[PDB]
Structures are given as C-alpha cells and as structure tokens.
Design a protein around this ligand. Structure first.
Ligand SMILES: CCCCCCCC/C=C\CCCCCCCC(=O)OC[C@H](O)CO
Ligand SMILES: CCCCCCCC/C=C\CCCCCCCC(=O)OC[C@H](O)CO
Ligand SMILES: CCCCCCCC/C=C\CCCCCCCC(=O)OC[C@H](O)CO
Ligand SMILES: CCCCCCCC/C=C\CCCCCCCC(=O)OC[C@H](O)CO
Ligand SMILES: CCCCCCCC/C=C\CCCCCCCC(=O)OC[C@H](O)CO
Ligand SMILES: CCCCCCCC/C=C\CCCCCCCC(=O)OC[C@H](O)CO
Ligand SMILES: CCCCCCCC/C=C\CCCCCCCC(=O)OC[C@H](O)CO
Ligand SMILES: CCCCCCCC/C=C\CCCCCCCC(=O)OC[C@H](O)CO
Ligand SMILES: CCCCCCCC/C=C\CCCCCCCC(=O)OC[C@H](O)CO
Ligand SMILES: CCCCCCCC/C=C\CCCCCCCC(=O)OC[C@H](O)CO
Ligand SMILES: CCCCCCCC/C=C\CCCCCCCC(=O)OC[C@H](O)CO
Ligand SMILES: CCCCCCCC/C=C\CCCCCCCC(=O)OC[C@H](O)CO
Ligand SMILES: CCCCCCCC/C=C\CCCCCCCC(=O)OC[C@H](O)CO
Ligand SMILES: CCCCCCCC/C=C\CCCCCCCC(=O)OC[C@H](O)CO
Ligand SMILES: CCCCCCCC/C=C\CCCCCCCC(=O)OC[C@H](O)CO
Ligand SMILES: CCCCCCCC/C=C\CCCCCCCC(=O)OC[C@H](O)CO
Ligand SMILES: CCCCCCCC/C=C\CCCCCCCC(=O)OC[C@H](O)CO
Ligand SMILES: CCCCCCCC/C=C\CCCCCCCC(=O)OC[C@H](O)CO
Ligand SMILES: CCCCCCCC/C=C\CCCCCCCC(=O)OC[C@H](O)CO
Lengths: 279, 285
C-alpha cells in the first residue's frame, strides 16, 4: 500500500487524496475474540427485540427508548463497527469508538430518569434527578474527550470524567436507598436491591474496561473489549429495564389489592435528611 | 500532530514523507480563514470570555438556588478559554482519516450547557419541584439532537446529511416543547414586567438556538461556505445570546418574582389551559 525509501527513514505513498497512517492498521483482535464478540452481539440484539415486544408501544417510555437505542446501536456495531464514523481514526494516530459514546449519551440519561422515579409515580421531580442527568452527561463528555485525546491529556480528562461519575454514583446510590424504603415490604424490596446490584456491577465496569481497552492501556483488543461491553449492556440496558418494568406492575398490583396507604417519614440517607414515602 | 512537511515528487502523483509514525493528509492542511475573519473571531471570543466572567461574578457563587446560570457560564468560561488557545489542536478539533475535520470542542460545549438551559426553562417561575414530564422530553430530545449532529459532523457524503435530518427531527420536538414552556411561563408570572422579560427570553432563545443548524449546514462541517474563523464569529454571537444574555434574564426574572411575592403576597388560581391542544394546568397570579 506504500513504499520505503532511503534506509527506512522515508516512506512514499500515492497522491490519490486518501489519508495515510500506519498506526491505523493495527489488528482488531484474535479470531477467537472476534467469534465471542459476534456471539454476544447477537444475544444483545435478540434480547432487545424480545424486550421491545414485551414492553409494547406513555408510562414506560423509558424502557422502550433504552431498548430502541440498544437495537440501533448493536445493529450498527454488527455491520459497520470499524467504519468511520462509528470508529474514528484521528490524525494523532489513535482511534476512538464514537458509536459507543453516542449510545451512552442516548441511553444513560434515560436509565437515570427511570431510577429517580422507581416507586409509585411521584410526578414532582426533584433536584436530584437533574443532578444525575447533568453529572452523567459531563461524565460521558469528558470520557469521550479522553478517548480522542492523547498522552497526558487523555488521563487528565479521564480523571475529570471520574469526578463527574462519582457525583452520579453518589446520587444514584441515594436513589436506591430512598427507593427501598418507598416500595412494599416483600418482593418489591428484593427487586430494588437486585436492580442496585446490577446497576453498580455493570456501570462500575465501564471505567475499568475503558482504562485497559484500546482507548487506554491497550491491553484488551477491540474485539475483546466488545465482548465486555456487550455483557455490561445486557445487564445495564436489558436486565435492568426489565426489572424496572416489572417493578412498576408489581407496585400497581399490590396497590389494587391493598390500597394506597403512605406516611411521610423523615430520615437521613447521605449528608442530609429526606422525607420519603412509606407503606 | 499530523504531517505538515512533504515533497510533491514524481509527476506530482506520488508524494513522499518522513517515516516517523506521523499521520499525513493534504485535506487537513486547509485554510482556517482570512486575516480579517481571524481578527473578527478573536474580538468575539474575548467579548464572550469577559461577559461570562462578569456574569459569574454577578451571580456570585452561593446544588444551590441558581446553579444553572453558574454552570452554563462556567461551561462558557471553559469553552472560550480552550477555543482561544487550542481551537485547532486535537481533540478540540479532530481530523479524520476520511479527510474531513470536526469541531468536537463545540459539541462538548453544547452537551454540558444545552440541557442545563432547558432545565432552567422548565422552571422559569419560582419555587422548587416544578420540572415534571416536559423537562425529560426537553433533555432527551436536546441530547439526541446534539448526538446526531455530532455524528453528522464526523461523517461524510450522504450519511452526513442523513444524520443531519435525524438531528432536525430531534430538534423540532425540542423546539416544540420549548415553545410551550414559554407559553406557560407567560401565564404563570406577574402580569407586568415579568411577562416582558419572559417574551424577551423567548425571542433570544429561538433566534439564538435556531441559528446553529443554519451555521452548521453552511459552515466547514456542511456546504463549506463559511471558514472556521467566520463560523466562529457566528457561534460566539449566538453564545452571547443563548448563554449570557439569556441566563442574565433568567437570573433577573427569579429576582423579580421573589421581589414581587415579598411585597404582594403569594396569591394564585389554577387555570385549566389549552397549550398546544391539550388540557394543561397553569397556575396564575
Ligand atoms: C433471546 C436470545 C435467544 C437465543 C440467542 C442465541 C445466541 C447464539 C448466537 C450465536 C451467533 C454465532 O455464533 O455466530 C457465529 C459467527 O458467525 C462465526 O462466524
Ligand atoms: C420478532 C421479531 C424478529 C426480528 C428478527 C430477529 C432476527 C434474529 C437474528 C439473529 C439471531 C442470532 C443468530 C446468529 C446470527 C449469526 C449472523 C452471522 O452470520 O454473523 C454475523 C455477520 O458476520 C455480520 O456481518
Ligand atoms: C446508538 C448510536 C447513535 C448514533 C448512530 C448514528 C451515528 C453514527 C453511525 C455510524 C455507522 C454508519 C456507517 C459508518
Ligand atoms: C466545566 C463545568 C465546570 C462546573 C464545575 C464548577 C461549577 C459547579 C458549581 C456549581 C454548580 C453545581 C451544579 C449542581 C448540579 C446539580 C444541581 C442539583 O440540584 O443537585
Ligand atoms: C486541558 C484542560 C482540559 C479541561 C480540564 C479542566 C476541567 C475542569 C472542570 C470541571 C472540574 C470537574 C467538576 C465536576 C463537576 C461535577 C459536579 C456536578 O455537576 O454534580 C453535582 C452533584 O451531582 C449535585 O450535588
Ligand atoms: C494514580 C493512582 C493510581 C493509578 C495507577 C497507575 C496507572 C497509570 C496508568 C496511566 C499511564 O501512564 O499509561 C501510560 C500510557 O502509555 C499513556 O497513555
Ligand atoms: C463486590 C461486588 C461489586 C458489585 C457492586 C456493588 C453493589 C453493592 O454493594 O450494593 C450496595 C448498594 O448500596 C445497595 O443499595
Ligand atoms: C450464561 C448465563 C446466561 C445469563 C443470561 C442473562 C440474560 C439477561 C437478559 C435479559 C433479562 C431478562 C430477564 C427476564 C427473564 C425471565 C424471567 C421472568 O421474569 O419470568 C417470570 C415468570 O414468572 C417465570 O416463568
Ligand atoms: C452582526 C455581525 C456582527 C459582527 C460580525 C462582523 C465580523 C467582521 C467580519 C470580518 C470578516 C473579514 O474581514 O473578512
Ligand atoms: C446581536 C448582539 C450580539 C453582537 C455582539 C458583538 C458583535 C461585535 C462584533 C464586532 C466584530 C468586528 C470585527 C472587525 O471589524 O474586523 C475587522 C477586519 O478584520 C478588518 O481587517
Ligand atoms: C457589551 C460589551 C461588548 C460591546 C461591544 C463590543 C464591540 C467591539 C467592537 C470592536 C471592533 C473594532 C476592532 O476590534 O477591530 C479592529 C479592526 O481590525 C481595525 O482594522
Ligand atoms: C469576587 C471575584 C471578582 C473577580 C473580578 C473579575 C476578575 C477578572 C479576572 C481576570 C480577567 C482578565 C482577563 C481579561 C481578558 C480580556 C482580554 C482582551 O481584552 O482581549 C485582548 C486579547 O487578549 C489580545 O490578545
Ligand atoms: C463584562 C463586559 C466586558 C466586555 C469586554 C469589553 C470589550 C472589550 C473590547 C474589545 C473586544 C475584544 C478586544 C479586541 C482585541 C482582539 C485581539 C486582536 O484582535 O489581536 C489580533 C492581532 O491580529 C494579533 O496579532
Ligand atoms: C466545554 C469544554 C468541554 C471539555 C472537553 C475538553 C476537550 C478537549 C480539550 C481541549 C484542549 C486541547 C489541548 C491540546
Ligand atoms: C434511537 C432512538 C429511538 C427513539 C424512537 C423510539 C422511542 C420513542 C418512544 C418512546 C420514547 C419517547 C421519548 C420522549 C420522552 C418524553 C418524556 C415525557 O415525559 O413526555
Ligand atoms: C423525543 C424525540 C423522538 C424523535 C425520534 C427521532 C427518530 C429517529 C431516531 C433514530 C434514527 C436512527 C437512524 C440513523 C441511522 C444512521 C446510520 C445508517 O443508516 O447507515
Ligand atoms: C432539512 C430539514 C429537515 C427537517 C425535518 C424535521 C421536521 C420535523 C420534525 C418533527 C417536528 C415535531 C413536532 C412535534 C409534534 C408533537 O410534539 O406532538 C406530539 C404530542 O403532542 C406530544 O407527545
Ligand atoms: C430571527 C428570529 C427571531 C424571531 C423568532 C420567533 C420568536 C417568537 O416568536 O417567540 C414567540 C414566543 O413563544 C412568545 O411567547
Ligand atoms: C440571534 C442571533 C443573531 C444571528 C446570530 C448569528 C449570525 C451572525 C453570523 C455572523 C457570521 C460572520 C461571517 C463573516 O464574518 O464573514
């Protein structure tokens, strides 16, 4: 595709108008790693289609939107993952997977909008809901910039992203505590706890996968990193929204057979005191 | 950085560069604008820089009442500073293997500021716990709008304009939701000075927000009429209106409503209104 010159110090290429960089030609992963990515992609696709069909087509727009985004994303990844602009190849020699950051920006705020109102629909939206959304957006923005950036700048932006993420994780964790005391005593408290465990395990893995992936320490290949992101998406997008959809109807069914008995009880969760709904 | 040194050798159809692991593309060496446009860009940058700092000093630093104005102007201070010193360095400006370039620093600016503006717009009146369901429709539609706009700038050829249209569909739903907020804000603030402020915020919002898709389609990520410097002039003027003039009025409005209630007392009446063909409950003074 090119030609050497001198003693390897000069390289010549055709003047055809196509950008050239040897650093863009690195391998994508091993044959076994590719097969695993294909397997997990089609599982994530097939589960989303099923969950879309289960949800239907309003109350419950969040789950639909998240799963619609998963279908679109996983479909574009199956067919045109390493094509620009799904994967961007920068003049600095590196590359970034912009298709994935776009996915996060569409779905992560919605998941958090669902989290701030897990229990019986309290239309009064708090200042906490805004704190989740704003911190999540800032987190992904500085994450995406760190993926495009290079050398020390990359890790400076990465750290800024972790600061945003911390506030988001903090606010998200306070939701799960308030959500627990706000749902019926039996089966509903377990689902909230299972949703919390699924949320932190999946959402906690992305920074780890980022730092060792092809946009960080270059340990994991793109194909390998794809397997890891597919599994997190299955838990964060599909398993979690199913539990959220399930939690709603179980709360509705409990109310029609028990009523709507609620007392305003005040307690402390984070560094403050909050009054929450109690059955 | 890319390669700026090369030699057009052979008949001109074969080019040679030093083999130093440095990416090379002639399409990246395009002009950034004229000396006049360069100056006009720098004038508008330092104006936005200075107004943002004055507003930040004016609002003062008190999850507080008025966090939106501070965050927006903080995003302004960070964006303009990075644009003044490192506008055309990567990743502020990204140069793709497809020959095109994109101003990612601007999309980052939008993603940080545009939702917060709409969060403020969702609650233009006083008090708290006023967001509800329109807010989410504003945020989700605004975010999707920027996301598909960013993808459009990264892409080339027909895909770019496909992504552009999808962004406009997102934007139209957002613009629609936004207009109903101003209609409801009019009927929920004191019938004197505050409604003139709300109407002025509405004009500034649409005139500034409506100009970004026009600048985009015509600038260096579109039909290539406006240079990067020229396109910077237009964006700075829109930012001064969208982020600085608009948040000052939002900050001013909140004072005027609080000063009104402090002397007039809190009196209200719930009115079942038709906003965009539906039953909306808007409380009036
Ligand atoms: C609801 C989901 C149910 C079943 C999903 C089954 C998933 C099985 C997906 C396997 C796909 C696969 O193995 O693809 C091989 C590849 O083509 C090698 O060349
Ligand atoms: C009810 C609505 C139904 C909607 C339709 C649902 C279709 C499910 C498709 C595949 C499932 C997984 C089967 C495994 C697919 C292997 C595909 C393959 O050959 O590999 C991918 C290829 O390499 C990439 O270009
Ligand atoms: C969920 C993702 C949202 C962004 C989708 C549109 C952006 C890029 C498409 C790139 C793939 C087109 C072929 C190259
Ligand atoms: C680049 C942007 C820099 C921003 C960092 C300095 C400015 C933050 C200070 C006050 C705003 C607090 C924001 C609170 C967001 C949640 C609001 C809430 O209600 O909780
Ligand atoms: C080369 C230089 C590149 C630029 C590098 C400098 C960037 C500094 C900006 C912000 C610091 C991080 C502040 C993170 C703000 C999070 C606070 C927040 O918004 O959350 C509020 C909370 O959730 C409700 O209480
Ligand atoms: C700091 C505390 C813990 C981080 C542990 C140390 C991990 C530092 C890895 C960041 C790094 O320097 O990576 C080098 C790479 O070549 C450049 O992108
Ligand atoms: C160690 C496994 C890590 C899995 C993620 C931790 C989840 C967790 O510990 O749950 C705490 C939460 O506060 C419950 O409400
Ligand atoms: C190798 C390990 C395989 C792990 C694969 C994890 C896939 C999770 C995907 C989506 C979540 C869907 C969860 C919903 C599953 C149905 C369970 C259910 O709720 O059924 C209720 C009914 O009462 C009982 O018959
Ligand atoms: C309303 C327009 C205001 C300022 C734009 C004028 C900027 C001056 C344009 C300079 C371009 C040039 O001089 O060529
Ligand atoms: C709507 C309200 C917002 C307008 C705010 C500022 C416009 C000020 C723009 C002034 C720009 C003048 C630049 C100029 O005159 O450039 C000279 C040229 O470069 C000779 O070579
Ligand atoms: C409210 C605060 C900003 C108000 C007005 C700024 C207008 C500034 C206009 C300055 C234009 C003159 C200039 O700077 O351009 C010099 C020109 O290049 C010589 O040939
Ligand atoms: C309570 C705290 C009160 C704080 C009070 C505010 C302090 C302002 C500080 C720094 C601004 C100085 C930077 C001013 C930038 C203007 C530069 C300019 O005018 O443009 C010329 C250009 O730099 C030619 O290269
Ligand atoms: C809070 C309100 C304060 C608002 C601010 C008050 C107005 C500042 C004056 C002029 C605008 C910018 C100054 C124009 C100078 C730009 C620098 C420049 O033009 O230098 C280019 C030169 O060609 C390099 O070689
Ligand atoms: C609003 C700002 C968004 C923050 C994201 C910062 C992105 C790139 C840093 C630009 C500096 C490039 C230095 C080389
Ligand atoms: C890839 C994007 C696919 C999007 C298209 C399929 C999803 C549309 C259906 C419901 C979501 C509605 C979102 C609007 C949110 C309104 C919130 C509200 O409260 O009203
Ligand atoms: C709340 C407002 C809801 C508005 C809903 C907007 C409808 C379009 C959504 C996704 C289109 C994705 C198609 C883009 C695919 C481009 C890649 C390709 O087609 O190749
Ligand atoms: C080149 C430019 C190409 C432009 C294409 C975009 C055109 C229209 C966007 C759709 C406008 C959205 C209208 C909102 C309708 C609405 O909100 O009503 C729904 C219901 O009342 C509440 O859920
Ligand atoms: C340039 C466009 C400036 C005019 C844009 C239309 C502004 C407008 O009509 O605002 C109406 C508002 O809804 C009243 O409450
Ligand atoms: C309300 C917003 C009013 C219009 C906003 C920007 C248009 C001004 C764009 C000026 C572009 C200058 C181009 C050039 O300098 O040539």
């Amino acid at each position: 595709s090119y030609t050497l010159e001198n003693n390897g110090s000069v390289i010549c290429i055709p003047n055809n108008g196509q950008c050239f960089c040897l650093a863009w030609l690195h391998s994508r992963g091993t044959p076994g790693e590719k097969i695993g990515a294909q397997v997990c992609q089609w599982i994530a696709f097939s589960i989303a289609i099923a969950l879309l069909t289960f949800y239907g087509f309003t109350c419950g727009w969040e789950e639909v939107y998240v799963c619609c985004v998963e279908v679109l994303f996983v479909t574009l990844e199956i067919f045109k993952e390493f094509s620009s602009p799904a994967t961007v190849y920068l003049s600095t020699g590196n590359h970034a997977y912009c298709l994935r950051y776009f996915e996060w920006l569409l779905s992560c705020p919605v998941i958090l909008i669902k989290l701030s109102n897990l229990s019986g629909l309290k239309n009064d939206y708090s200042k906490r809901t805004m704190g989740l959304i704003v911190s999540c957006v800032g987190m992904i923005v500085f994450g995406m910039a760190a993926g495009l950036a290079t050398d020390w700048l990359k890790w400076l932006l990465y750290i800024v992203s972790c600061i945003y993420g911390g506030y988001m994780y903090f606010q998200a964790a306070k939701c799960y505590v308030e959500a627990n005391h706000s749902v019926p005593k039996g089966h509903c408290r377990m689902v909230v706890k299972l949703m919390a465990y699924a949320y932190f395990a999946s959402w906690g893995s992305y920074p780890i996968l980022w730092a060792v992936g092809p946009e960080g320490l270059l340990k994991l290949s793109p194909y390998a990193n794809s397997i890891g992101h597919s599994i997190c998406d299955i838990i964060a997008k599909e398993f979690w929204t199913f539990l959220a959809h399930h939690l709603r109807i179980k709360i509705h069914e409990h109310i029609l057979i028990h009523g709507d008995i609620r007392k305003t009880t005040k307690m402390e969760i984070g560094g403050e005191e909050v009054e929450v709904e109690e059955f």
